[PDB]
Amino acid sequence: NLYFQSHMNVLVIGRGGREHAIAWKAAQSPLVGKLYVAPGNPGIADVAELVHIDELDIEALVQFAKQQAIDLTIVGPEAPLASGIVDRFMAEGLRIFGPSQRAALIEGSKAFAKELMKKYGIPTADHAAFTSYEEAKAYIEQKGAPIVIKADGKGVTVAQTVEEALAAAKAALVDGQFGTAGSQVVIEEYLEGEEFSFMAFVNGEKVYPLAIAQDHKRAYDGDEGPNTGGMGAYSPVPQISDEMMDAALEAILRPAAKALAAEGRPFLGVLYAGLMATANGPKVIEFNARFGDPEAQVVLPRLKTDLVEAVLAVMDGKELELEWTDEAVLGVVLAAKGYPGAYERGAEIRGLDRISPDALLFHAGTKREGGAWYTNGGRVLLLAAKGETLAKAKEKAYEQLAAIDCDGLFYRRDIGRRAI
Ligand SMILES: Nc1ncnc2c1ncn2[C@@H]1O[C@H](COP(=O)(O)O)[C@@H](O)[C@H]1O
């Protein structure tokens, strides 16, 4: 219904699966003439031209963007946002979809986020930091247990009793790292319920919600092992009621966007809320200032609305209702053995040519050499599949995953298990 100039030159900043998903979606826009990804990866080269410039080499990206007359730049990773890529681009008159350094702090500093949510009455887990044991003790005795104790320098304890919490807190301050302000201990309210990711396009106070998704951050099946950037995800999320979703939109997302704007930090881009559906309603775990990975890989394929058109509409503050397919999407991450810890690179990946054309294969950390594929990163690939139902999406995804053979990769087999 909306009109925007065609034959656009578009630049996507990043190198992972999230960027491959963004590029893939952008390439299908009738408004795009030329698509570039910096620095991208071998898999992304199949849908866009790679630009050999680091995401943090801001001065070069600015020059490149002006040189190639880029009409729109989309930032994937948070690093360049935290570095002020948006600020520099805007000063050069370059259109870019992403938050300013000041607004991106919502993700950069968990303390800032907690500070903001407390001031504006946004539901979230209680949070407090201490350098004094006596002060930590008094606080712990007020909140009770179970409670979370976090030491700096492994260091996270979910204390089941107040006594254990005190022992852990004392240990954190005694054995924790000695910073320039001494040792410190972080205490947080332990929340229970179903976790879900709620992303939305934002521009000032205007919020445009995206479909919600559920990511499994634990490294191993049965949600065991250390936390990761995400080992799998799916959308929609049946177990999250529409009421929980709406409460999240009206009591969390809209208020956060208004809070940032009220604080002189208007946000533009994708505001990603990591939430917990508790019995008392939705509560924020953390905020991210851009597309989540692997959330983007399973949510963007469900978006029927043209992505580029949507982004431009948001940037112009125009009205827009996003449309989504009824079909579900589930994705599974293939990671290098050892990840999220130390992992090896260089294992050959066979079978990428055996996967169905309907399967969505997003490259993270792959490398092409001598006509073959090799692992080259923590998270290497993500394979997603569409399905009439979540169960169908899950079956198709895992069915296709078996076609891949690599002794240097592993992947959870329980993605979507509980949901179904
Ligand atoms: N206050 C909390 N209550 C329950 N779980 C939490 C809390 N904070 C963090 N987590 C878990 O830790 C994971 C990663 O958050 P983080 O360790 O801060 O990077 C989340 O996906 C949650 O499952």
Side-chain angles (χ1 to χ4, degrees):
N1 295 61
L2 293 178
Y3 165 88
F4 291 115
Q5 300 76 186
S6 65
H7 288 65
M8 298 172 71
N9 291 163
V10 173
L11 170 65
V12 174
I13 311 294
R15 64 176 63 190
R18 160 183 51 213
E19 291 66 38
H20 189 168
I22 294 179
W24 169 71
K25 259 298 184 180
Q28 304 175 191
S29 168
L31 301 57
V32 179
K34 294 186 176 182
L35 180 64
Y36 304 83
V37 183
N41 62 53
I44 298 165
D46 295 318
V47 307
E49 172 172 357
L50 304 186
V51 178
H52 311 307
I53 300 168
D54 188 69
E55 303 96 322
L56 295 176
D57 193 337
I58 300 323
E59 252 47 64
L61 294 173
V62 177
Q63 298 310 304
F64 173 83
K66 300 179 67 63
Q67 281 257 298
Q68 304 301 303
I70 298 301
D71 299 293
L72 175 68
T73 296
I74 304 180
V75 187
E78 196 280 309
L81 300 175
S83 295
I85 187 164
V86 175
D87 299 86
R88 289 292 299 96
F89 265 54
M90 297 188 294
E92 300 301 72
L94 294 168
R95 306 208 65 175
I96 183 166
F97 190 60
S100 68
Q101 185 176 57
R102 284 175 61 68
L105 187 61
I106 189 66
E107 186 194 319
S109 172
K110 183 173 181 177
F112 169 67
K114 291 293 178 178
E115 169 188 357
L116 190 66
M117 292 186 274
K118 184 176 184 177
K119 176 180 181 177
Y120 288 92
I122 299 166
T124 185
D126 296 307
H127 176 95
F130 301 94
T131 62
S132 164
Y133 175 66
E134 294 306 310
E135 302 186 3
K137 176 180 180 177
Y139 183 76
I140 291 167
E141 290 181 353
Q142 292 295 303
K143 302 302 177 182
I147 190 167
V148 188
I149 308 300
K150 296 185 179 177
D152 299 356
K154 301 180 297 300
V156 179
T157 291
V158 184
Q160 294 304 309
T161 65
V162 168
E163 287 77 2
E164 287 165 291
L166 296 182
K170 185 78 171 302
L173 293 172
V174 172
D175 309 310
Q177 99 174 302
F178 193 71
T180 50
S183 61
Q184 181 191 74
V185 66
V186 173
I187 304 158
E188 297 186 59
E189 180 182 5
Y190 180 59
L191 293 181
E192 297 187 302
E194 195 72 53
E195 296 185 59
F196 68 106
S197 306
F198 197 165
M199 302 183 288
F201 292 138
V202 177
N203 180 350
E205 306 190 310
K206 307 181 69 62
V207 183
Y208 308 75
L210 304 192
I212 271 102
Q214 187 186 72
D215 176 55
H216 299 64
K217 299 186 186 302
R218 306 295 288 183
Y220 315 123
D221 302 3
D223 304 291
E224 292 286 358
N227 284 304
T228 69
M231 295 296 285
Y234 57 84
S235 177
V237 187
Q239 64 278 202
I240 298 299
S241 68
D242 301 306
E243 292 70 41
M244 190 64 70
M245 181 285 278
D246 195 50
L249 179 58
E250 301 304 318
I252 298 182
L253 290 179
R254 293 184 184 293
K258 297 177 185 177
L260 288 170
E263 290 298 310
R265 303 163 181 282
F267 190 107
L268 172 67
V270 175
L271 179 57
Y272 167 1
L275 310 173
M276 183 71 86
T278 75
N280 314 295
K283 298 189 176 186
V284 180
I285 293 189
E286 88 275 351
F287 274 114
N288 295 291
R290 39 60 190 181
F291 277 116
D293 188 319
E295 285 87 342
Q297 293 95 299
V298 305
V299 173
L300 294 178
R302 303 191 59 225
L303 183 67
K304 297 174 64 182
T305 303
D306 178 56
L307 180 62
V308 182
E309 173 186 357
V311 169
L312 295 173
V314 174
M315 291 179 69
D316 290 325
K318 295 178 181 178
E319 298 306 319
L320 175 64
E321 185 189 71
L322 300 171
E323 299 310 338
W324 309 83
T325 66
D326 293 298
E327 302 196 66
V329 172
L330 181 151
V332 180
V333 175
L334 288 83
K337 284 183 183 166
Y339 175 80
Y343 61 78
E344 295 304 306
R345 315 160 82 89
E348 199 181 326
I349 307 166
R350 290 184 165 72
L352 295 190
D353 310 300
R354 305 165 182 165
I355 288 90
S356 175
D358 298 303
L360 308 181
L361 185 68
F362 297 117
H363 289 63
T366 58
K367 185 202 359 180
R368 271 291 291 186
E369 189 185 304
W373 295 94
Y374 298 93
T375 61
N376 188 50
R379 295 192 288 182
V380 181
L381 300 154
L382 180 146
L383 188 157
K386 308 178 190 297
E388 180 180 299
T389 66
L390 259 177
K392 292 180 181 297
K394 178 185 176 301
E395 274 105 60
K396 298 174 65 178
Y398 277 106
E399 193 170 301
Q400 294 295 300
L401 280 169
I404 296 174
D405 295 302
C406 182
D407 291 301
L409 296 173
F410 80 93
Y411 64 94
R412 291 182 57 172
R413 316 316 185 75
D414 67 323
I415 300 300
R417 191 184 67 65
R418 293 199 60 61
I420 294 153

